Amino acid sequence: GPPGPPGPPGPPAPPGPPGPPGPPG
Amino acid sequence: GPPGPPGPPGPPAPPGPPGPPGPPGP
Amino acid sequence: PPGPPGPPGPPGPPAPPGPPGPPGPPG
């Protein structure tokens, strides 16, 4: 038989890195 | 014969971007 | 018989932005 169709989307990915430091106090 | 099964799930997306700036310092 | 499995699916949903950064310098 012919090849099956594409699988489902991949799983979620982790959060990116932390943002930069905030402004001076 | 019948079409094959669906493929496997894809991979994850690449690393995410940084978060936003933190709060003011003390 | 059934054919071979299909190809892998697309990449998953975009990774979320990270956490807020730390507090700024004293200030």
Min Cα distance A12 → chain C (Å) is 6
Residues B11/C15, Cβ–Cβ less than 8 Å: no
The sign of the CA dihedral C15, C16, C22, C25 is positive
Alpha helices in A1-25 (DSSP H): none
Closest C-chain CA to A2: C3
Name the method of structure determination: X-ray
d(CA B4, CA A11): 22
* Residue A13 to residue C17, Cβ atoms within 8 A: no
Amino acid identity at C27: G
Q: DSSP for B1-26, please give it.
A: -PPPPP----PPPPPPPP--------
d(CA A24, CA B23): 9
- Taking residue B16's Cβ as centre, other Cβ atoms within 10 Å add up to 16
* Residue B14 to residue A13, Cβ atoms within 8 A: yes
d(CA B10, CA A22): 37
* Residue C6 to residue B7, Cβ atoms within 8 A: yes
d(CA C16, CA C22): 18
